[PDB]
Write a protein that binds this ligand. Structure first.
Ligand SMILES: Cc1cc2nc3c(=O)[nH]c(=O)nc-3n(C[C@H](O)[C@H](O)[C@H](O)COP(=O)(O)OP(=O)(O)OC[C@H]3O[C@@H](n4cnc5c(N)ncnc54)[C@H](O)[C@@H]3O)c2cc1C
Ligand SMILES: Cc1cc2nc3c(=O)[nH]c(=O)nc-3n(C[C@H](O)[C@H](O)[C@H](O)COP(=O)(O)OP(=O)(O)OC[C@H]3O[C@@H](n4cnc5c(N)ncnc54)[C@H](O)[C@@H]3O)c2cc1C
Lengths: 576, 576, 104, 52
């Protein structure tokens, strides 16, 4: 291991890979550290759902997600167990057991918040939705010039969409996708617009989608190699990055202190440029362990030297969720162009349609698939083919419906096992609220309790803000009940509900961006540089300082691309 | 991909890897096909539990196991869902949905039986116990000379133990381990012997154990390579092997028909020698899809042409399970050698002991750990150090207790512990019964229903035989209840229970071994060669024809090694 | 607060309560058996609109209580069964069993 | 609880729950036979199961 690099990046998630891709491509000598390990196959940091086996068994992937997500702050457990044998060791109090955080108020938690420590980060298992934010949800990159701001976000998002391979066409021939898209489009005609979820993914075959991940952005292979002979990059897995060292004037970072988990050694790594992309919780943890913000229970009667806004104004979206079972009417409509004669299972049975008929409700491709299904599987009571891909439908956030929507099927940590109802009938509904940033909503770190890597234990003090955020969240639940009823009734066991705070994993604003540190109550500027420091940049959702409802990764990636522009304007790569 | 090899092996679990180690090492040109993919990291087919993150969070590994195990035969669901919306599409019958198997009788199933399709097979997540079988559980390799049989088994087991890196001291300095071991040793003094579970694992540090896997047997890297310039091996993942092609005379296999899951193309591969190691279920499926045994619901009115015993005489172990919470008396004895001054937390707190004082009940390595724990964590009410390794205690199968026992902690698809009771207190009890082989106990394949890979759907017809197997199983339950109570009372939520048939995953006898095809009712001889065929061999637990309680993998491995000795004597490597 | 919204069901000849000629109940009388589905058309469409109306209405008072989320209850839990010996003016014209004096 | 106690179900279909974890020595059913008051005439999917 070299001990000198041009650029060091902490975290190998898709935002650290954005910095790699830009900086390695421009000739910088780059090192990347991840506390976690290469597990995902020969494609380093690739999506774990890209196996034939998972794509044949997509519900099983929930268990993989559950397995790698580690809860961020678990309050002390107060469950009463009073049927132990009288001989068994029995506690007298609810003591600190099994990694729990006694700093945590159980009623002001994001109990669902969790992290993933693996090479590629959460992109090894995310659901790949990458919508753009409209102006109302998005921070300003240019003030007092809206068309210039729009133009800058358009250039960055388009680039970001190329890195992720974002598209809106991978599900265009699914019968279920079109059944639901067309119905919603018709019902809301001229009030709301429906489209495919923009997905970071490339379809390889009718039954397989290559989901994008960090690996798609940057392949994570050591360089130089035969494909990039003039580039320089080294990834170091199983390395915990613990602290950046500030110079005495707080104008520069002088080193990164690391802990190699396999050998035990602890080193200082020196770079020209330090990039932190360890996630919204862990960027904040590393900064606070390095003398930024305030360690310990916040204490206003004692102002921090540096970055007083760090870990305040945190935002996390409200999530409401339900599943439906498709209406009898919609399922009958699937075979509306068909002529069916005879009884299924006898030689006289047949299913035909008129190709190209002007008054057909469906296109020939749909009707051929129905026909074939019904004719080859005459025991099956449904018209939807067995390997039909899932619906992937959205109506994006608008002023009149200020929440993001997904009307689809995919794997999340809270997916349930359902066996009794045919899966072809079931559609998931996920509506995502925006949360106003408030100073009182905080991520802070204990000065006593440490986590499993011996770093300061994360602690949340969070409630959804009263006012607009809470009114929108309840309106959004109503919207989901109203809209979902157009498609079918709720699936028993997946009735409409707010999910545990944080489960949606879209935390932002922990190290937030703005034009001016004091006036905009922020930590980094629009180049993602930490105020006061020449050579320290932060990337990730933590930078986003606005109330958003749409999934944030694409936006965070776009900020990282602008950040790399600034780096390339201000630091020169070492000669090879 | 060449079309011609010396040896082809179907399956990359630890039994396939045994054939690979032996034959690639003896110079054969070998190819290995697996239907699943490389996921586990840059060590191909390595144990997934070997990440720093799993080992700091071992309870999460349960979720990984759940995600990768796919149920073999799921009967048609008959749960009544009568609270659907009146608008939702509603069933008239319990039709076949969600991959269920309409051939399956739900009351004669191995409902717990499941398979893993990944490179390395189940060894990417197993619990690494590798006991030898005593005479009573083991098939004869030598007729009419018990001491020669014994010597041949000892020679094979000792190689197998070398391949797996089997050891019995990786847990020797665990407090919890020794606390349980010592107490059980004393309670059964002169009646039963206790020891460490033999485990395929190597300890690397006080907090890290490298669990063994297929990778340990053979690293699965293509050859020739720098480290092995004279060897020849190619691994082809994501290739479903579908049929071995019999010659018209039923004397030889002429090719292996494969489906490349990524390109979609179907090929025939030629080899001199064909080795099937796809697991006890899928070896059987592949043979039946190739014209061996009988396809469809068994029909005596129609003897099959070849291997009439294929899929009959199947065995699976009964499994009883509970968890206990450590007794107060045992917990108090952990600290019996300590001198304690004053009062925890308070200034003057000191904990000491006298190294070597024969009045000590415990060794110095133990007291040093207790002492350090109690001084560095004075708030914690227990004297077991937080990083203490798990217990791994067994008393092996004996005539007077004819069941294998594990008294330990490890990750399985069930048995997830929880957060109310300190995990240092908890011990798992798994007792495993032996099941008599009976002809009427069968694994068969549908002639109409197919599985997710379009192969004949496996179907079980199984009950624990009445008589000894059933009597033993109930005696085993009582034995667990009596034994467990010397250590602590049951943990609420893990009370003593029989586990669902097949969850233990120790299925045997589906393609069983013997001396004589007809007199021994078997499919392969003691070289693992399919009767009548020159060039077809099977490996795995499916070979074992006896009633066994212990974990079968080491025994399967031993038979594979004998098989390789036959192959080496009877086929010549192509020139290199 | 509890929210209970009750829909009306169209009377359909095919929805029946009949009694076994073989199986008996606890008092040695013919075992009741149902053959029932909510009629498609108006009854079903109203019932779903009624669900939506409860979600829209209840939200004005508060959000759902976890563990008591909006759901259809098991058919008949409501115990308002009717029409098993129905009233009308004319036995044949009105497919009924009793007249407006409740006389058979 | 008073109410649940006095309400007797009018037609309970034959139960077809799978209990496959009985001890091997326990008496075990080969079919889903008529148990504990259930009604074999009743189609489980066209019932008023809450009628009592
Ligand atoms: C199930 C699921 C579904 C999701 N769906 C979507 C969606 O559809 N759309 C969307 O936009 N987002 C979604 N997300 C969220 C998305 O995955 C994250 O926003 C994204 O991965 C954030 O990227 P990142 O690079 O900032 O952080 P991460 O991906 O979290 O990567 C940060 C990394 O740094 C590491 N690290 C942490 N601390 C240290 C340290 N001290 N030293 C060294 N390394 C460290 C980690 O091990 C990790 O690799 C989903 C995620 C989940 C789990
Ligand atoms: C949680 C867990 C705990 C366990 N603990 C223990 C224990 O402690 N000790 C004990 O002895 N064992 C235990 N086992 C069982 C042990 O893992 C198996 O006995 C062992 O892996 C069998 O080895 P194998 O090589 O025969 O088969 P497998 O490991 O099942 O490998 C068979 C392989 O062949 C493949 N395949 C299947 N069909 C095809 C096909 N048609 N074409 C091509 N490839 C195919 C698979 O994808 C797979 O990789 C445990 C299992 C699990 C899941």
């Amino acid at each position: 291991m070299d001990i000198k690099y041009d650029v060091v990046i902490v975290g190998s998630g898709p935002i650290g890979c954005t910095y790699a891709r830009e900086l390695v491509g421009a000739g910088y000598k780059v090192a990347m550290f991840d506390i976690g390990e290469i597990d995902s196959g020969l494609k380093i940091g690739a999506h774990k759902k890209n196996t034939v086996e998972y794509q044949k068994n997509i519900d099983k992937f929930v268990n993989v997600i559950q397995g790698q997500l580690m809860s961020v702050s678990v309050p002390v457990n107060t469950l009463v167990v009073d049927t132990l044998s009288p001989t068994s060791w029995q506690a007298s109090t609810f003591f600190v057991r099994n990694g729990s955080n006694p700093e945590q108020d159980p009623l002001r938690n994001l109990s669902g918040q969790a992290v993933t420590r693996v090479v590629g980060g959460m992109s090894t298992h995310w659901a790949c939705a990458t919508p753009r934010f409209d102006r109302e949800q998005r921070p300003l990159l240019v003030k007092d010039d809206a068309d210039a701001d729009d133009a800058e976000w358009d250039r960055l998002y388009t680039k970001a969409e190329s890195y992720f391979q974002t598209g809106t066409d991978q599900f265009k021939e699914s019968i279920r996708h079109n059944l639901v898209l067309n119905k919603l489009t018709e019902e809301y005609k001229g009030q709301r617009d429906f489209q495919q979820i923009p997905l970071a993914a490339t379809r390889r075959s009718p039954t397989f989608v290559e989901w994008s991940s960090a690996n798609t952005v940057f392949d994570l292979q050591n360089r130089p190699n035969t494909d990039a002979p003039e580039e320089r990059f080294n990834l170091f897995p199983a390395v915990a990055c613990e602290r950046v060292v500030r110079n005495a004037l707080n104008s520069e970072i002088e080193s990164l202190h690391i802990h190699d988990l396999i050998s035990g050694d602890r080193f200082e790594i020196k770079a020209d440029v330090y990039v932190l992309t360890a996630g919204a919780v862990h960027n904040t943890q590393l900064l606070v362990n390095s003398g930024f913000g305030q360690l310990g229970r916040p204490n206003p009667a004692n102002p921090p030297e540096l970055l007083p806004s760090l870990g305040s104004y945190i935002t996390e979206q409200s999530l409401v969720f339900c599943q439906t079972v498709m209406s009898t009417e919609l399922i009958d409509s699937v075979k509306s162009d068909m002529t069916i004669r005879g009884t299924p299972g006898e030689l006289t049975y047949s299913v035909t349609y008129t190709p190209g008929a002007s008054t057909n409700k469906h296109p020939d491709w749909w009707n051929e698939k129905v026909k074939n299904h019904m004719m080859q599987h005459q025991e099956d009571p449904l018209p939807i083919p067995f390997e039909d891909p899932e619906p992937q439908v959205t109506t994006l956030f608008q002023p009149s419906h200020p929440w993001h929507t997904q009307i689809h099927r995919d794997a999340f940590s809270y997916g349930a096992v359902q066996q009794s109802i045919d899966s072809r009938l079931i559609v998931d509904w996920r509506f995502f609220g925006r949360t106003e940033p408030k100073e009182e909503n905080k991520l802070w770190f204990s000065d006593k309790i440490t986590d499993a890597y011996n770093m300061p234990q994360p602690t949340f003090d969070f409630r959804f803000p009263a006012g607009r955020t809470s009114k929108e969240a309840e309106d959004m639940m109503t919207d989901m009940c109203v809209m979902s009823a157009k498609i079918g009734g709720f699936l028993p066991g997946s009735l409409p509900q707010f999910m545990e705070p944080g489960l949606v994993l879209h935390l932002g604003g922990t190290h937030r961006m703005g034009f001016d540190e004091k006036e905009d109550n922020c930590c980094v500027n629009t180049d993602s540089r930490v105020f006061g420091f020449k050579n320290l940049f932060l990337g990730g959702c933590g930078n986003i300082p606005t109330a958003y409802g749409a999934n944030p990764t694409l936006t965070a990636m776009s900020l990282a691309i602008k950040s790399c522009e600034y780096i390339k304007q201000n630091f020169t790569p070492s000669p090879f």
